Amino acid sequence: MREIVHIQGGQCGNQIGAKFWEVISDEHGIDPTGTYHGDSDLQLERINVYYNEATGGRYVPRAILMDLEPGTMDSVRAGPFGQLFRPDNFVFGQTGAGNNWAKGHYTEGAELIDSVLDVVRKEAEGCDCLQGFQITHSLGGGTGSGMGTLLISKVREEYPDRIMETFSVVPSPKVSDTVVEPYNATLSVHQLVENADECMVIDNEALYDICFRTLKLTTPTYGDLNHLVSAAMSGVTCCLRFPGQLNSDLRKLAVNLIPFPRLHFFMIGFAPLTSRGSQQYRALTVPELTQQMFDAKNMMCAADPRHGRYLTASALFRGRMSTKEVDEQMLNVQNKNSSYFVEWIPNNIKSSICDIPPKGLKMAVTFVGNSTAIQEMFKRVAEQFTAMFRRKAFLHWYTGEGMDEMEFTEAESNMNDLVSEYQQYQDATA
Amino acid sequence: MREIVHIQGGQCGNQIGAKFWEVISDEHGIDPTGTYHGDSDLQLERINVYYNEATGGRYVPRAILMDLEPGTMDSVRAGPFGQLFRPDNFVFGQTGAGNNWAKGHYTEGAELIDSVLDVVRKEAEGCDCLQGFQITHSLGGGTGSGMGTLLISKVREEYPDRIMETFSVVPSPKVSDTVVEPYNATLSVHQLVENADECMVIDNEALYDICFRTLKLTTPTYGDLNHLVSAAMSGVTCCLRFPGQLNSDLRKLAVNLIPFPRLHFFMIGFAPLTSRGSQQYRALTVPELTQQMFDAKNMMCAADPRHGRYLTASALFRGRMSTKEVDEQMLNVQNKNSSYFVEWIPNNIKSSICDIPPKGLKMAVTFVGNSTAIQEMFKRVAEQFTAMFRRKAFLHWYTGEGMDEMEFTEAESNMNDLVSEYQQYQDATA
Amino acid sequence: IEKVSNVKIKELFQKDDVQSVYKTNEFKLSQLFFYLKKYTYREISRQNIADNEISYKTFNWFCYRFNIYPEIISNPKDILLIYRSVTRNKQVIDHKPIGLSEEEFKEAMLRISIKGKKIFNKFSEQLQKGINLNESEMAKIADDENKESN
Amino acid sequence: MREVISIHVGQGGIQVGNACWELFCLEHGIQPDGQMPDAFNTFFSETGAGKHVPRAVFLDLEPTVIDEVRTGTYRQLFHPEQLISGKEDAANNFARGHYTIGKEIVDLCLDRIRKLADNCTGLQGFLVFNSVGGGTGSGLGSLLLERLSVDYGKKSKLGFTIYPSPQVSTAVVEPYNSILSTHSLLEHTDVAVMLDNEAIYDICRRNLDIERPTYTNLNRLIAQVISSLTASLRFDGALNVDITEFQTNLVPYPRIHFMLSSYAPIISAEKAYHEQLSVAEITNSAFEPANMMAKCDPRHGKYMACSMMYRGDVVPKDVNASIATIKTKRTIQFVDWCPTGFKVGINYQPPTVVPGGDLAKVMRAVCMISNSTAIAEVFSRLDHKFDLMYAKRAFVHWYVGEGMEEGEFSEAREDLAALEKDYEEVGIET
Amino acid sequence: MREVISIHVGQGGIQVGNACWELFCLEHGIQPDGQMPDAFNTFFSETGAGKHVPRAVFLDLEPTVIDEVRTGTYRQLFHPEQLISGKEDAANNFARGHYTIGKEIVDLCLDRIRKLADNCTGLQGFLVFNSVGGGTGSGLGSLLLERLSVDYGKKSKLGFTIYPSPQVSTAVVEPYNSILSTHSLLEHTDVAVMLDNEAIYDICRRNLDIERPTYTNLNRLIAQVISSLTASLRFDGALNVDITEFQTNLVPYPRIHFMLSSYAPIISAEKAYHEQLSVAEITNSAFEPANMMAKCDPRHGKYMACSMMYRGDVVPKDVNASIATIKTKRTIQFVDWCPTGFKVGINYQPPTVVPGGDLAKVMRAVCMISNSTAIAEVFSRLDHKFDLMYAKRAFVHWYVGEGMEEGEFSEAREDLAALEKDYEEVGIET
Numbered sequence A, B: 001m002r003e004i005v006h007i008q009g010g011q012c013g014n015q016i017g018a019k020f021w022e023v024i025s026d027e028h029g030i031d032p033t034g035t036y037h038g039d040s041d042l043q044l045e046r047i048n049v050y051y052n053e054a055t056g057g058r059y060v061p062r063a064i065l066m067d068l069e070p071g072t073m074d075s076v077r078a079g080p081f082g083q084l085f086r087p088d089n090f091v092f093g094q095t096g097a098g099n100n101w102a103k104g105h106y107t108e109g110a111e112l113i114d115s116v117l118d119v120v121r122k123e124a125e126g127c128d129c130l131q132g133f134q135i136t137h138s139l140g141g142g143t144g145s146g147m148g149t150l151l152i153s154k155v156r157e158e159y160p161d162r163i164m165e166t167f168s169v170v171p172s173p174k175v176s177d178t179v180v181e182p183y184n185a186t187l188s189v190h191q192l193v194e195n196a197d198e199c200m201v202i203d204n205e206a207l208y209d210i211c212f213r214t215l216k217l218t219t220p221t222y223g224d225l226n227h228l229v230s231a232a233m234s235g236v237t238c239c240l241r242f243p244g245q246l247n248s249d250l251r252k253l254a255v256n257l258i259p260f261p262r263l264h265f266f267m268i269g270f271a272p273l274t275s276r277g278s279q280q281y282r283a284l285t286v287p288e289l290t291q292q293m294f295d296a297k298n299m300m301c302a303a304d305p306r307h308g309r310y311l312t313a314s315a316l317f318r319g320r321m322s323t324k325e326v327d328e329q330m331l332n333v334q335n336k337n338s339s340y341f342v343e344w345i346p347n348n349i350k351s352s353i354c355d356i357p358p359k360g361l362k363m364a365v366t367f368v369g370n371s372t373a374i375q376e377m378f379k380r381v382a383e384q385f386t387a388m389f390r391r392k393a394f395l396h397w398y399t400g401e402g403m404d405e406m407e408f409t410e411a412e413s414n415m416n417d418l419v420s421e422y423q424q425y426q427d428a429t430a
Numbered sequence C: 001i002e003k004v005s006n007v008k009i010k011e012l013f014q015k016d017d018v019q020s021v022y023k024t025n026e027f028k029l030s031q032l033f034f035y036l037k038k039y040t041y042r043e044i045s046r047q048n049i050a051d052n053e054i055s056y057k058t059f060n061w062f063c064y065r066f067n068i069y070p071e072i073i074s075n076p077k078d079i080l081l082i083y084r085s086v087t088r089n090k091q092v093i094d095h096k097p098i099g100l101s102e103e104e105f106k107e108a109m110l111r112i113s114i115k116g117k118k119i120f121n122k123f124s125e126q127l128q129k130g131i132n133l134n135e136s137e138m139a140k141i142a143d144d145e146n147k148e149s150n
Numbered sequence D, E: 001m002r003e004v005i006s007i008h009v010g011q012g013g014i015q016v017g018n019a020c021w022e023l024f025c026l027e028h029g030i031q032p033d034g035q036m037p038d039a040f041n042t043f044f045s046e047t048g049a050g051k052h053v054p055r056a057v058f059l060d061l062e063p064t065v066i067d068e069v070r071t072g073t074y075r076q077l078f079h080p081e082q083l084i085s086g087k088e089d090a091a092n093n094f095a096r097g098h099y100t101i102g103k104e105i106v107d108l109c110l111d112r113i114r115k116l117a118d119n120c121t122g123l124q125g126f127l128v129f130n131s132v133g134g135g136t137g138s139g140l141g142s143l144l145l146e147r148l149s150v151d152y153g154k155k156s157k158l159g160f161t162i163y164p165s166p167q168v169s170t171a172v173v174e175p176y177n178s179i180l181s182t183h184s185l186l187e188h189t190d191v192a193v194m195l196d197n198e199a200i201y202d203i204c205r206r207n208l209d210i211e212r213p214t215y216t217n218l219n220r221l222i223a224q225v226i227s228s229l230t231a232s233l234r235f236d237g238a239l240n241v242d243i244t245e246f247q248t249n250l251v252p253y254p255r256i257h258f259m260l261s262s263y264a265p266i267i268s269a270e271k272a273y274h275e276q277l278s279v280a281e282i283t284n285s286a287f288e289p290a291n292m293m294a295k296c297d298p299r300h301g302k303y304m305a306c307s308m309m310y311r312g313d314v315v316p317k318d319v320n321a322s323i324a325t326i327k328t329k330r331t332i333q334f335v336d337w338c339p340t341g342f343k344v345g346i347n348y349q350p351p352t353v354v355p356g357g358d359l360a361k362v363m364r365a366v367c368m369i370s371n372s373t374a375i376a377e378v379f380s381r382l383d384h385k386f387d388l389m390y391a392k393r394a395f396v397h398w399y400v401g402e403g404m405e406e407g408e409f410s411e412a413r414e415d416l417a418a419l420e421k422d423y424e425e426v427g428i429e430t
């Protein structure tokens, strides 16, 4: 019951999913052949959340994979746990977008999306009680940031009451791999605010910083960043698949973390994270988890959370632990940092406890906090956008496929209005 | 009891039968040597429907094969399961028709048909209780469309109370292999409406479209089209050979699907159909079967069923399933599509359940719907006929064998009258 | 301020001009309402709606199909506000959706008109200037307003 | 010295006869072979040494169901030559089973009826089962009733007909033969009980909590109702009721004998024992409109007379204390000219459970047979369905060509109009 | 012939119901299977032979907790179909569980309540448990109370609500629904008892010496309080008290019925037996402000009436000699218009111990239910918390979009202001 379907688009989203599904399968004891080989009874009670049942007793994820080029899905199939995905759900084009947002949203993405919407509708109509959808995509690419966001609007138009999740990677100015990143980032943020019920920003720069400083491993690769993102993704829905002292589905988090409908851009972090050589030194206790959870360097975004004030915060503890300690520590982390918490909403931290810890760990915490410090990312994105747009650089590529500069002006104005009205509440006082 | 005999004519009909009998033999576990090697008891209880018994314990189909040239039957004998056919039933001429309807219906087909009618009479007089006849032939050829249709009238004149089936392939204008197709199509449709109790149109264009889009196989061949047609053919009489919750012979379908005696031209479709790579993704459920069953692209004809309104519909479910789900889904498919169902006849969908599924499949559905959208095929056939006839092109070939233009004029007028009176009920309101 | 807005409506609903649309809305029962009702009859959810009422989906389809939205009512929320304002006194009985019993749909159409003067306000200004609006001028004014609103 | 003969005709009739005959054999301790390893005499007969033979006859023109019966576990029970079978099915055509093929079979059935009746000495009456929406069922039921009404005269006959659902339907032509059969049995049957499938589907879904029911689950409930009705003839009870004591208590006028039934309690073993199942609560549940065995609303009409049977350890004073409560309620109102309308029967034998079935074992149960004015709605809706297609004379050619006259359809319409006028005339207060 | 029905709604309600139902089963000697290996009748019912069924019903929209109950050791105890469960959680939204999803479930709960009430003959009243700071708990509790107040009328209902702590909180939006639920139960519940978690945490820490408590330890103390309150109905005592004998002794005015409880002694077996536990010292400990079960200071307000229950071998003269000492003390002052304010009950059965629990076995115990003027502080602080966020209309869109009107928040504020004014008006001397 109350299950969700998985939809991913683009190369970055496909690579994120290729590790997210591996993590989920390892958590539920599903072999790469789709056969259950788990140890505990609880591993099968709520498997309908992510997995479907077919004849022969094997399980198949309800994931939908889409891209405008076939290479990435032809590569993910040969990887581990690549056989679980149903071949029918693979939809792809023969041309690609070339990191051009217009091509992936107006000319090419519009004709292809009917086939993927057909299978999306097939998956949603069938399921017992829908909880919602979760979306993984990147804002630094053309086909992803175009087709995914248009699909968001199409899904929202047909299921207005369901919940919608988006895990979005925004292009940081530090590690830049594409010159046309500001254009399709700014165009995508315009559409994303209007339809997504929840959005979670993730930055490659913050992932590299975490890998270099906390884990202290010499050579980070995309596999480590994907593993961290996958652990963070799994931590959110853990209590929906396992029993606990205070169950809290996604809708309950939506109620408690979004004060106003347009303020739904969160930054997350996962604890504990320790190096291989120091994993024996540390002792896992609730104070040790909560001190690392609110650490500024532990956030999955380069945004500095002590440059603003938290509107609200959430924590999803895992493992068996006493609730009194959790509540007193949450109170203590809020009394010692009163300057960084907005004062006109008292008791702005939500807590939840799940009795099933991750495989290999005795305690774990997932942190989701809505803070005013996120304005800095939109500020720098808009700064680069307006630095590049004033000369009409690279504009002809977009304008040759039916798009105009008016949609750029409206997007810039709406993004600046969002930036302004997000900080409006930072200076608000009672 | 209540068995039927098989009669096929022409090259296309012979190729259809060469796969239909293979499918039937594989379903009943009969080896190509005529020896039973089946597993289940039910495989032998009603084998008298299609197979006769001879000394030595082997089984022989009661099929009659006729053509005006010996090549096709000399070729089908060397194929798999070709030895089952009794050599006595092979009747052929030494000249052929050359795709000329007049030669295959007036000059050559008239003298030969006595021998084939002798064996037809031998087969029908002997059998326990006759149910009827089923005919496979093509309307795009001369000898087939002539001799088969004249044989229809001869059989109807002697057995007026029995039921008659015809599976007719009409020449589509998209994939045209013969220039004189409109003439012998129009001449054949004139005679076919007067005598056939049921007619089922099949188009090569729709078969290619299905093979390319649903199965997604690279290189279709006549073997795949024949296999699809054979599965559709077998699905109709399944409950007459196996037990079920609601048995429904051919006469019961005749009662419930033909409102007026001249409206008996149906288009069919088979479900499920899935690609090799996506056969593991899909889960077989009644909603999944019924959503594909009413799909427009799944019809075995290029006629678009949402261009008209269904007069009535029928479904023959296979496998063990709950009847409540079937009835509620049939109601739902009729409430959500009220615009495409005629309103002066309520509850115009017939359902049947057979507990024996096809070999290798757990559930299957055969769909037979009488719709007003079939007018478009006769419209285009008559359009080509009147475009070619106004100049008297290729007319001398037909007029040199005792035929005249008056029979062409009467055929055109009757076909146009059929087209008009078939759509007369589309605009009828209560 | 809130009390004053509440005090402000209901008088508009009782005006002869609004009742005439709804008087004409009786004629919608006469033919437009009979067609809308026939569309509501195509909804299987009709078992949950009274036989003399139309659903919110049918009313929203009417507003979209007759260019009331976006030309006259720029915001789709206003259609919902009109519908809710007309049906405000109807209680949900037995979990059945609230239909347009005589006019919650007529009240929703008034809220669309009043809620957003827009395309229909421009038509009213042109008509008050004595300009006979032909269908091509109406389409052009509606297109120009839809472009200014997007 | 009291006997009753049950007649089963058609597929639905045979499939409900199987359902009742497992239950009777189980209730009287008789093994499926017919051998026991003085109450049996009502349904069975002693052969002198050993086995018992049911006083039942199975009729059908289509041989599949009878062949299934003659090979199951009950092959040894029934006499080999009382399972009369035909060769050709009527195929949902009423005129076939009343004029063409039923006449040649009816003589054998009447001979079997005579041979069974000469054995009985205290024949109470006949029972007949037939699904109305079929050719052979309705036609042969009509013909058998018409022959029996003149061969025997005043002997009582009871009909457990299954009318089609308001919107759910399996055929497309069932209103025609339903109306004709209602015409036939209106003047020929003493009692008719309503049994449409949709209401029983809702009962199973709501109470038994089965989401995918099949026909067997419906037939088991019908069998339980039959057993509850006939328990008083073969078990000791404080307040007995005979079959002949019905037209004096439930039938105010000779024309009005259609009534609808209900049963209580219906509950599964998983939650049955958590509640006490007092007589008051079960007799309240029996009168709930949602627990009617036919999809009709009793709140839309008056009651005429209620005959309701108890069985188990119920005490008469508790029954009276519950009849008073029902008379108190304002939502149930009786007709003016009927001050008391309840006939009560009490039996000691608790209902028997069938292994592997749905119902659990309970000590108290109630079965009500109630005659109400609200039944006219099903007649009105069937009449409306009939008129839509009879306006254009659709499907009439399938009936005129089977020997039936053109005017035979109109007089059934006139008799239904007369019945509807009579039901309105009776329900008005003086 | 005296009965009481307990209602458990929400996660906290179900988790405290489990806690009380181990204790009752242990106290009456009933095994977890429900089988004994005349005092049980207050909470249980006899099924005729063997097991006992609790007079309790469990409600929740989120299925996890009920599924945990239905698989534990107590799976055989509760009736299978009185554990009503939903599919979609309210997610801390009050408007959801009062207007959207609770309405479709409330009918089944009311049917179950009727089915349980018809069994009881001497129904004393209802008990209800619900954690206030949640969506489904508060909303469904409000709706059930509102339905029961009109279905039954003058029957007494008791509410053991758990209000949020002054500063410790798990959610961020709980003041809104706490205020709304207080509005709802102010005019609908006869008794409300305060149960916030922080005070009980302090009690456990100080007396039980547990530094890491969980929810089970809190729920066991609450269960002990419930058992002490209801002991007088099922055990012989020198001075009995009934539930109906409360509004005549603790409720001076219809509006004022919120009171706070305390319990004594609370001590572990490691140091319990070193001291004599005289009645004087336990009745002194019960009146200590630090041992209040709700975090309120009684020194800040007057007392109105004290109802306090003893159980064990206590003698009335020792009770009087201790009431005199309390009247002597200058730190405890009663209101002017109440000369005597004590109601005393004495029971003989000592409190029962749960194996593996915290509390030890003792021969004397005291439970006090005291109504005091100091309770207004919790209302004032909840009101202050509410006003801070309602000034900016934060989180209101999550409630307006679930069918609730804008003005519904204001009238709850006005009712709280009225209650606070009433508490001030009552506490002034004449």
Ligand SMILES: Nc1nc2c(ncn2[C@@H]2O[C@H](COP(=O)(O)OP(=O)(O)OP(=O)(O)O)[C@@H](O)[C@H]2O)c(=O)[nH]1
Pocket (backbone or CB within 6 Å): B245, B246, B252, D009, D010, D011, D012, D013, D015, D016, D062, D089, D090, D091, D092, D093, D131, D132, D133, D134, D135, D136, D137, D138, D162, D164, D169, D170, D171, D174, D197, D215, D216, D218, D219
């Ligand atoms: N309750 C119930 N109804 C059935 C069952 N089987 C068939 N029916 C009903 O019977 C109607 C059609 O008549 P059938 O009994 O199936 O067929 P028939 O009476 O033998 O008539 P023919 O079609 O000529 O063979 C359908 O509309 C079904 O609703 C059954 O097992 N239980």
Ligand SMILES: Nc1nc2c(ncn2[C@@H]2O[C@H](COP(=O)(O)OP(=O)(O)OP(=O)(O)O)[C@@H](O)[C@H]2O)c(=O)[nH]1
Pocket (backbone or CB within 6 Å): A245, A246, A252, E009, E010, E011, E012, E013, E015, E016, E062, E089, E090, E091, E092, E093, E131, E132, E133, E134, E135, E136, E137, E138, E162, E164, E169, E170, E171, E174, E197, E215, E216, E218, E219
């Ligand atoms: N004393 C006590 N309080 C609890 C317990 N569990 C939850 N609570 C309180 O309940 C409040 C929230 O309501 P819950 O009971 O957890 O959830 P709910 O009532 O089912 O409402 P939903 O969130 O919609 O499911 C929290 O603030 C907790 O303080 C418990 O086991 N014991």
Ligand SMILES: Nc1nc2c(ncn2[C@@H]2O[C@H](COP(=O)(O)OP(=O)(O)O)[C@@H](O)[C@H]2O)c(=O)[nH]1
Pocket (backbone or CB within 6 Å): A009, A010, A011, A012, A015, A016, A099, A138, A140, A141, A142, A143, A144, A145, A176, A177, A178, A204, A222, A223, A225, A226
């Ligand atoms: N975490 C992670 N990020 C990736 C990976 N591959 C690419 N990216 C990021 O995705 C961005 C490029 O996106 P792109 O591949 O063009 O998206 P597309 O246009 O939808 O295919 C780069 O800035 C990378 O930082 C990966 O395997 N893991």
Ligand SMILES: Nc1nc2c(ncn2[C@@H]2O[C@H](COP(=O)(O)OP(=O)(O)O)[C@@H](O)[C@H]2O)c(=O)[nH]1
Pocket (backbone or CB within 6 Å): B009, B010, B011, B012, B015, B016, B099, B138, B140, B141, B142, B143, B144, B145, B176, B177, B178, B204, B222, B223, B225, B226
């Ligand atoms: N499905 C199928 N169709 C065929 C096959 N062979 C020929 N046809 C069709 O039959 C038509 C020609 O018919 P023809 O062979 O002249 O019939 P004939 O005159 O009776 O021999 C062509 O348009 C083909 O589409 C086959 O093997 N399978």
Ligand SMILES: [Mg+2]
Pocket (backbone or CB within 6 Å): B247, D010, D011, D062, D089, D136
């Ligand atoms: Mg039949």
Ligand SMILES: [Mg+2]
Pocket (backbone or CB within 6 Å): A247, E010, E011, E062, E089, E136
């Ligand atoms: Mg909950």
